Write a protein that binds this ligand. Structure first.
Ligand SMILES: [Mg+2]
Ligand SMILES: [Mg+2]
Ligand SMILES: [Mg+2]
Ligand SMILES: [Mg+2]
Ligand SMILES: [Mg+2]
Ligand SMILES: [Mg+2]
Ligand SMILES: [Mg+2]
Ligand SMILES: [Mg+2]
Ligand SMILES: [Mg+2]
Ligand SMILES: [Mg+2]
Ligand SMILES: [Mg+2]
Ligand SMILES: [Mg+2]
Ligand SMILES: [Mg+2]
Ligand SMILES: [Mg+2]
Ligand SMILES: [Mg+2]
Ligand SMILES: [Mg+2]
Ligand SMILES: [Mg+2]
Ligand SMILES: [Mg+2]
Ligand SMILES: [Mg+2]
Ligand SMILES: [Mg+2]
Ligand SMILES: [Mg+2]
Ligand SMILES: [Mg+2]
Ligand SMILES: [Mg+2]
Ligand SMILES: [Mg+2]
Ligand SMILES: [Mg+2]
Ligand SMILES: [Mg+2]
Ligand SMILES: [Mg+2]
Ligand SMILES: [Mg+2]
Ligand SMILES: [Mg+2]
Ligand SMILES: [Mg+2]
Ligand SMILES: [Mg+2]
Ligand SMILES: [Mg+2]
Ligand SMILES: [Mg+2]
Ligand SMILES: [Mg+2]
Ligand SMILES: [Mg+2]
Ligand SMILES: [Mg+2]
Ligand SMILES: [Mg+2]
Ligand SMILES: [Mg+2]
Ligand SMILES: [Mg+2]
Ligand SMILES: [Mg+2]
Ligand SMILES: [Mg+2]
Ligand SMILES: [Mg+2]
Ligand SMILES: [Mg+2]
Ligand SMILES: [Mg+2]
Ligand SMILES: [Mg+2]
Ligand SMILES: [Mg+2]
Ligand SMILES: [Mg+2]
Ligand SMILES: [Mg+2]
Ligand SMILES: [Mg+2]
Ligand SMILES: [Mg+2]
Ligand SMILES: [Mg+2]
Ligand SMILES: [Mg+2]
Ligand SMILES: [Mg+2]
Ligand SMILES: [Mg+2]
Ligand SMILES: [Mg+2]
Ligand SMILES: [Mg+2]
Ligand SMILES: [Mg+2]
Ligand SMILES: [Mg+2]
Ligand SMILES: [Mg+2]
Ligand SMILES: [Mg+2]
Ligand SMILES: [Mg+2]
Ligand SMILES: [Mg+2]
Ligand SMILES: [Mg+2]
Ligand SMILES: [Mg+2]
Ligand SMILES: [Mg+2]
Ligand SMILES: [Mg+2]
Ligand SMILES: [Mg+2]
Ligand SMILES: [Mg+2]
Ligand SMILES: [Mg+2]
Ligand SMILES: [Mg+2]
Ligand SMILES: [Mg+2]
Ligand SMILES: [Mg+2]
Ligand SMILES: [Mg+2]
Ligand SMILES: [Mg+2]
Ligand SMILES: [Mg+2]
Ligand SMILES: [Mg+2]
Ligand SMILES: [Mg+2]
Ligand SMILES: [Mg+2]
Ligand SMILES: [Mg+2]
Ligand SMILES: [Mg+2]
Ligand SMILES: [Mg+2]
Ligand SMILES: [Mg+2]
Ligand SMILES: [Mg+2]
Ligand SMILES: [Mg+2]
Ligand SMILES: [Mg+2]
Ligand SMILES: [Mg+2]
Ligand SMILES: [Mg+2]
Ligand SMILES: [Mg+2]
Ligand SMILES: [Mg+2]
Ligand SMILES: [Mg+2]
Ligand SMILES: [Mg+2]
Ligand SMILES: [Mg+2]
Ligand SMILES: [Mg+2]
Ligand SMILES: [Mg+2]
Ligand SMILES: [Mg+2]
Ligand SMILES: [Mg+2]
Ligand SMILES: [Mg+2]
Ligand SMILES: [Mg+2]
Ligand SMILES: [Mg+2]
Ligand SMILES: [Mg+2]
Ligand SMILES: [Mg+2]
Ligand SMILES: [Mg+2]
Ligand SMILES: [Mg+2]
Ligand SMILES: [Mg+2]
Ligand SMILES: [Mg+2]
Ligand SMILES: [Mg+2]
Ligand SMILES: [Mg+2]
Ligand SMILES: [Mg+2]
Ligand SMILES: [Mg+2]
Ligand SMILES: [Mg+2]
Ligand SMILES: [Mg+2]
Ligand SMILES: [Mg+2]
Ligand SMILES: [Mg+2]
Ligand SMILES: [Mg+2]
Ligand SMILES: [Mg+2]
Ligand SMILES: [Mg+2]
Ligand SMILES: [Mg+2]
Ligand SMILES: [Mg+2]
Ligand SMILES: [Mg+2]
Ligand SMILES: [Mg+2]
Ligand SMILES: [Mg+2]
Ligand SMILES: [Mg+2]
Ligand SMILES: [Mg+2]
Ligand SMILES: [Mg+2]
Ligand SMILES: [Mg+2]
Ligand SMILES: [Mg+2]
Ligand SMILES: [Mg+2]
Ligand SMILES: [Mg+2]
Ligand SMILES: [Mg+2]
Ligand SMILES: [Mg+2]
Ligand SMILES: [Mg+2]
Ligand SMILES: [Mg+2]
Ligand SMILES: [Mg+2]
Ligand SMILES: [Mg+2]
Ligand SMILES: [Mg+2]
Ligand SMILES: [Mg+2]
Ligand SMILES: [Mg+2]
Ligand SMILES: [Mg+2]
Ligand SMILES: [Mg+2]
Ligand SMILES: [Mg+2]
Ligand SMILES: [Mg+2]
Ligand SMILES: [Mg+2]
Ligand SMILES: [Mg+2]
Ligand SMILES: [Mg+2]
Ligand SMILES: [Mg+2]
Ligand SMILES: [Mg+2]
Ligand SMILES: [Mg+2]
Ligand SMILES: [Mg+2]
Ligand SMILES: [Mg+2]
Ligand SMILES: [Mg+2]
Ligand SMILES: [Mg+2]
Ligand SMILES: [Mg+2]
Ligand SMILES: [Mg+2]
Ligand SMILES: [Mg+2]
Ligand SMILES: [Mg+2]
Ligand SMILES: [Mg+2]
Ligand SMILES: [Mg+2]
Ligand SMILES: [Mg+2]
Ligand SMILES: [Zn+2]
Lengths: 95, 107, 70, 97
RNA sequence: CCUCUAAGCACAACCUGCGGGAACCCGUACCGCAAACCGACACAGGUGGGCGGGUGCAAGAGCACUCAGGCGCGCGGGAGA
RNA sequence: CGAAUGCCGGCAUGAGUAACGAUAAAGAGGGUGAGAAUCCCUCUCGCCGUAAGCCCAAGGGUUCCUACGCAAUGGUCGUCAGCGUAGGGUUAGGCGGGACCUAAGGUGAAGCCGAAAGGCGUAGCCGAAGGGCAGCCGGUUAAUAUUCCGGCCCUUCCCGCA
RNA sequence: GAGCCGGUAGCGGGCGUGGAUCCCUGGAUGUCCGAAUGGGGGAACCCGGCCGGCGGGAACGCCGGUCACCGCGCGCGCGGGGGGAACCUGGGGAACUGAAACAUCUCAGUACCCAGAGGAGAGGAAAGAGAAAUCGACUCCCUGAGUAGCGGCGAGCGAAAGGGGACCAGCCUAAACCGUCCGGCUUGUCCGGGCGGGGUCGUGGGGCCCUCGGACCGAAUCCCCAGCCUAGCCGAAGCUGUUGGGAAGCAGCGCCAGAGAGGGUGAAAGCCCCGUAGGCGAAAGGUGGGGGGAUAGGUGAGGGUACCCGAGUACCCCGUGGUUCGUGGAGCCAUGGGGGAAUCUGGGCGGACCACCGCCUAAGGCUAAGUACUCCGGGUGACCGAUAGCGCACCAGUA
């Protein structure tokens, strides 16, 4: 069955992600078939918050090699939800 | 399907052949893929290791090497003699290893 | 997981109800996502816990399916 | 240049043979073939507009079985046929063949 | 978009004004007159659209000098047949 | 097998030979580094400027940013790079394309045609760099922004009131 | 039946006699594209209708279910669509070449294209063959035979009967006649369409009409089973000494053998390991051509009657195709065009035609095995052994 935990996968762990916590903007590794409307409900129904805005984008998989073979890391998608003024997703403030 | 092993870790075996032929001991491991076995104190070999946090001071470390299974032979705990493994059908009706020299069991 | 544990998880599940199975599942899939974020930061050393849930979550959805196929 | 809807006839293939000279039976050397080339023979198809169940039914049938159409018609009298549409009355007749 | 009526509907419906809420999928990096595109090459070739400043030369998207911006072209050093 | 301007491959000769891809051009200093004409900084000189500068679109597809590297690619050298490894980076209700429209053309209810395959065909559907539609300025990051932030505007749809 | 978390070690953590990994059969899940089918589409992308659920949910979005077209059958049901290495049948169908040029001819109805089918396909129960006064469906192999014949009688093409083998099997309908339901108008002894009965053959048979007589066959459909397939299991008999890195080598003494095929083990092992001869084995799917049982289905005789016995068909001519037959004396089989019958006193045939004598009984259909191929699995080679053998022994239809 599909649950908000199936939409949200892992957090974006970078200097750029972190720097969004102050403004309440939390970044995640979502599902490429996920949807801004689909994400929202997933964050809320999982982090007890009020999503006010969502910004998503696709991250294409990098091409890599074991010297002799060429492949590609999977393609990923990530969202950038804005939470109501004053709310916090603590598990990410972690940091 | 399965690799046929007449010996299992860790019953007592007789190094039938090889440089350590005649020596005896327990089977410290069983390698079906290469169809080999490691025996305690047998096939000893000196191997090198980097000056590494695990192996400070560098140096070498005596490893126990594997042997082809056809080289090892089990020792019946009864007659204490190395024997060929038959297989007995109890009334369980399980099958059990049993010495061929004497009807003893081997586990 | 351990077998005996597995067996129980089947006995216990097959005693349950689809709602109590969806609700149950819905939780362990939360229990995963918790673990996913831990490993994502390296603070997941018992990383075998993951595989269990998914295969717990799997064993659950199955028994859920056993019921509904009727 | 197609298929009889009643006889199943169909364009066959025939050769166009060209012969020269006097035959033997006419006290000659004999005929000689100067050029063979495939042709194709069509059934003499024609249209057959008939009205059945207050509905016009037309067949693309060969001139040979034309008198069979009316037979089908004549034979179709004993059928619930009103209310139907053209293609429906055709298929219902053909089923009689 | 405006307008005209037809069934239907005329407690609906549509127009205007205000109010709260709602507003999805893909693309967005970088090269792009070229070392990243077409030419087997980091190839003096070919490739659509826009901007393209200043002074002087009659004019100009010409010509020469120059701002911003960008370059000295991915082998050098000597020699003076 | 000794020959087929034979076939596959390996290695020689020409030979340290021509050449190293526009005659727009170079010089010194400082640093770096085992190692520098070839990388970074600085000053002087030269060169394009209806461009050899700045945007958009096709096409390429991670080549963009940063850290650590120089065996191989770079026509030399290389501590450099569009190269090797790893990590990070592309954020739209208003910019472009869709849930809007039609063009040539493509397909194609009805219907016509053909030995089979298939070929035609008003409507309708598909079809764009044409039509139509509501975002302008600035700041921010090493790397994205008419996309995030700020200020000031606007569009459409659902519900409710008048 | 003791190790496992694939090729794959390592970092980091687990599991297994409370029987794991692994192997075999059934089931569940099975995103997106693809016949692709809700609609579109530059395949794996994009946009909808309906019913139901989620979220604070009306707009927005996600989840489950359903919605393309065609045929057949009384809006709803069963079926079709596409793929498959060759093998098979049907609809079409060349050329180089050979003829030492070349057109008829050959290459050849082969290559190729298309539709279709299946584990096989086709063919198949005589309107046959053809001279035995005989044979007895069809298919395949041998033989008949490069015979008979065909042929710018050039190059070349090339049968059939009969005989010896493999396999073996025969059936259902249409029409006359009885009955029944429906619908047509031109009212019945009517015509027409369904269904059922009846009937299916060539010593001709069948119907109706009298008359005489009233159980043994048995499936190709269904059922049960053995048998087989897809994992497996038991499986006889050697130590020592010696050279050597290693024994399976040489020496000594023994043993098994329904097993001295082969492959491994540190080298050359009947008796060390995997195996070999000889035996065992299936809860579940599949198959089941052999065994047993059902069922649909099967069957008499003389006598008279002269209703039926498969239609634009047989038959004639015209244009072709197949057969060994290239217009030849040219029949037989098939049919595009024209004309156009009959129901046993019928009709087709026996190589133009006529007669005698004989064979057969068309214009509806079905039908096992023996036959063909080899993507697949297995056994085996006086087959190759990394320029060989498949194009690939290796991440190849890849760079
Ligand atoms: Mg699921
Ligand atoms: Mg930063
Ligand atoms: Mg909310
Ligand atoms: Mg986006
Ligand atoms: Mg996107
Ligand atoms: Mg790269
Ligand atoms: Mg000893
Ligand atoms: Mg043995
Ligand atoms: Mg399990
Ligand atoms: Mg003619
Ligand atoms: Mg004559
Ligand atoms: Mg002639
Ligand atoms: Mg007419
Ligand atoms: Mg006529
Ligand atoms: Mg007929
Ligand atoms: Mg009005
Ligand atoms: Mg009205
Ligand atoms: Mg009202
Ligand atoms: Mg408003
Ligand atoms: Mg959408
Ligand atoms: Mg560049
Ligand atoms: Mg540029
Ligand atoms: Mg630029
Ligand atoms: Mg230029
Ligand atoms: Mg330009
Ligand atoms: Mg130009
Ligand atoms: Mg080229
Ligand atoms: Mg290039
Ligand atoms: Mg160039
Ligand atoms: Mg040009
Ligand atoms: Mg001027
Ligand atoms: Mg001038
Ligand atoms: Mg000029
Ligand atoms: Mg100029
Ligand atoms: Mg000039
Ligand atoms: Mg130069
Ligand atoms: Mg230069
Ligand atoms: Mg140069
Ligand atoms: Mg020089
Ligand atoms: Mg000189
Ligand atoms: Mg020679
Ligand atoms: Mg030469
Ligand atoms: Mg040469
Ligand atoms: Mg020469
Ligand atoms: Mg060569
Ligand atoms: Mg010199
Ligand atoms: Mg010279
Ligand atoms: Mg010279
Ligand atoms: Mg030179
Ligand atoms: Mg100059
Ligand atoms: Mg310097
Ligand atoms: Mg210096
Ligand atoms: Mg240098
Ligand atoms: Mg250097
Ligand atoms: Mg230079
Ligand atoms: Mg200027
Ligand atoms: Mg592009
Ligand atoms: Mg490229
Ligand atoms: Mg880079
Ligand atoms: Mg280098
Ligand atoms: Mg180097
Ligand atoms: Mg270098
Ligand atoms: Mg190089
Ligand atoms: Mg170099
Ligand atoms: Mg070069
Ligand atoms: Mg260095
Ligand atoms: Mg650097
Ligand atoms: Mg760069
Ligand atoms: Mg790089
Ligand atoms: Mg390296
Ligand atoms: Mg970084
Ligand atoms: Mg915006
Ligand atoms: Mg738009
Ligand atoms: Mg929408
Ligand atoms: Mg349109
Ligand atoms: Mg068309
Ligand atoms: Mg049109
Ligand atoms: Mg539309
Ligand atoms: Mg447009
Ligand atoms: Mg436009
Ligand atoms: Mg607008
Ligand atoms: Mg716009
Ligand atoms: Mg404005
Ligand atoms: Mg950035
Ligand atoms: Mg009102
Ligand atoms: Mg692994
Ligand atoms: Mg470890
Ligand atoms: Mg999904
Ligand atoms: Mg579809
Ligand atoms: Mg479509
Ligand atoms: Mg709904
Ligand atoms: Mg949702
Ligand atoms: Mg849905
Ligand atoms: Mg098929
Ligand atoms: Mg054919
Ligand atoms: Mg042709
Ligand atoms: Mg020819
Ligand atoms: Mg030839
Ligand atoms: Mg010849
Ligand atoms: Mg030939
Ligand atoms: Mg010739
Ligand atoms: Mg010749
Ligand atoms: Mg010629
Ligand atoms: Mg031929
Ligand atoms: Mg054919
Ligand atoms: Mg097809
Ligand atoms: Mg097919
Ligand atoms: Mg068979
Ligand atoms: Mg058949
Ligand atoms: Mg018959
Ligand atoms: Mg003969
Ligand atoms: Mg002969
Ligand atoms: Mg002759
Ligand atoms: Mg021939
Ligand atoms: Mg015969
Ligand atoms: Mg015979
Ligand atoms: Mg046989
Ligand atoms: Mg028989
Ligand atoms: Mg009747
Ligand atoms: Mg009779
Ligand atoms: Mg039968
Ligand atoms: Mg054994
Ligand atoms: Mg020794
Ligand atoms: Mg010995
Ligand atoms: Mg042997
Ligand atoms: Mg043998
Ligand atoms: Mg051997
Ligand atoms: Mg030998
Ligand atoms: Mg041996
Ligand atoms: Mg046997
Ligand atoms: Mg058995
Ligand atoms: Mg009878
Ligand atoms: Mg009688
Ligand atoms: Mg009669
Ligand atoms: Mg002919
Ligand atoms: Mg003649
Ligand atoms: Mg003829
Ligand atoms: Mg004949
Ligand atoms: Mg005819
Ligand atoms: Mg007669
Ligand atoms: Mg007669
Ligand atoms: Mg005849
Ligand atoms: Mg005749
Ligand atoms: Mg005759
Ligand atoms: Mg005859
Ligand atoms: Mg005769
Ligand atoms: Mg006669
Ligand atoms: Mg006959
Ligand atoms: Mg007949
Ligand atoms: Mg048949
Ligand atoms: Mg068959
Ligand atoms: Mg057969
Ligand atoms: Mg094979
Ligand atoms: Mg060999
Ligand atoms: Mg050999
Ligand atoms: Mg090789
Ligand atoms: Mg090879
Ligand atoms: Mg070799
Ligand atoms: Zn014993």
């Amino acid at each position: 069955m599909k649950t908000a935990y199936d939409v949200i996968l892992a957090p974006v762990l970078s200097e750029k992600a972190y720097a969004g916590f102050a403004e309440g903007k939390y970044t995640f590794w979502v599902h490429p078939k996920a949807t801004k409307t689909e994400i929202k409900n997933a964050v809320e129904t999982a982090f007890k918050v009020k999503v006010v805005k969502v910004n998503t984008l696709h991250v294409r998989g990098k091409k890599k090699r074991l010297g002799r073979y060429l492949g590609k890391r999977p393609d990923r998608k990530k969202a950038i939800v804005q939470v109501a003024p004053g709310q916090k997703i603590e598990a990410l403030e972690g940091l | 399907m399965r690799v046929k092993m007449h010996v299992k870790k860790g019953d007592t075996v007789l190094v039938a052949s090889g440089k350590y032929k005649g020596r005896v001991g327990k089977v410290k491991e069983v390698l079906p893929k290469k169809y080999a076995v490691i025996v305690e104190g047998v096939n000893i070999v000196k191997k090198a290791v980097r000056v590494s946090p695990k192996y400070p001071q560098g140096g070498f470390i005596e490893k126990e090497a594997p042997l082809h299974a056809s080289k090892v032979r089990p020792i019946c705990p009864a007659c204490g003699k190395p024997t060929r493994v038959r297989k007995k059908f109890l009334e369980n009706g399980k099958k059990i290893r049993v010495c061929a020299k004497c009807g003893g069991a081997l586990d | 997981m351990k077998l005996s544990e597995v067996r129980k998880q089947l006995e216990e599940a097959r005693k349950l109800s689809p709602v109590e199975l969806e609700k149950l599942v819905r939780e362990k899939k939360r229990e995963l996502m918790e673990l996913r974020f831990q490993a994502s930061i390296g603070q997941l050393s018992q990383n075998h816990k993951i595989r269990d849930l998914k295969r717990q979550i799997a064993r659950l959805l199955t028994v859920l399916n056993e019921k509904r196929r009727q | 240049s197609k298929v009889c809807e009643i006889s199943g006839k169909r364009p066959i293939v025939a050769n166009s043979i060209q012969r020269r000279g006097k035959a033997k039976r006419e006290g000659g050397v004999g005929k000689k073939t100067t050029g063979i080339s495939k042709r194709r023979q069509y059934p003499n198809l024609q249209k057959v507009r008939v009205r059945v169940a207050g509905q016009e039914i037309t067949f693309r049938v060969a001139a040979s079985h034309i008198p069979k159409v009316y037979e089908l018609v004549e034979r179709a009298k004993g059928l619930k046929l009103e209310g139907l549409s053209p293609k429906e009355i055709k298929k219902e007749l053909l089923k009689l063949l």
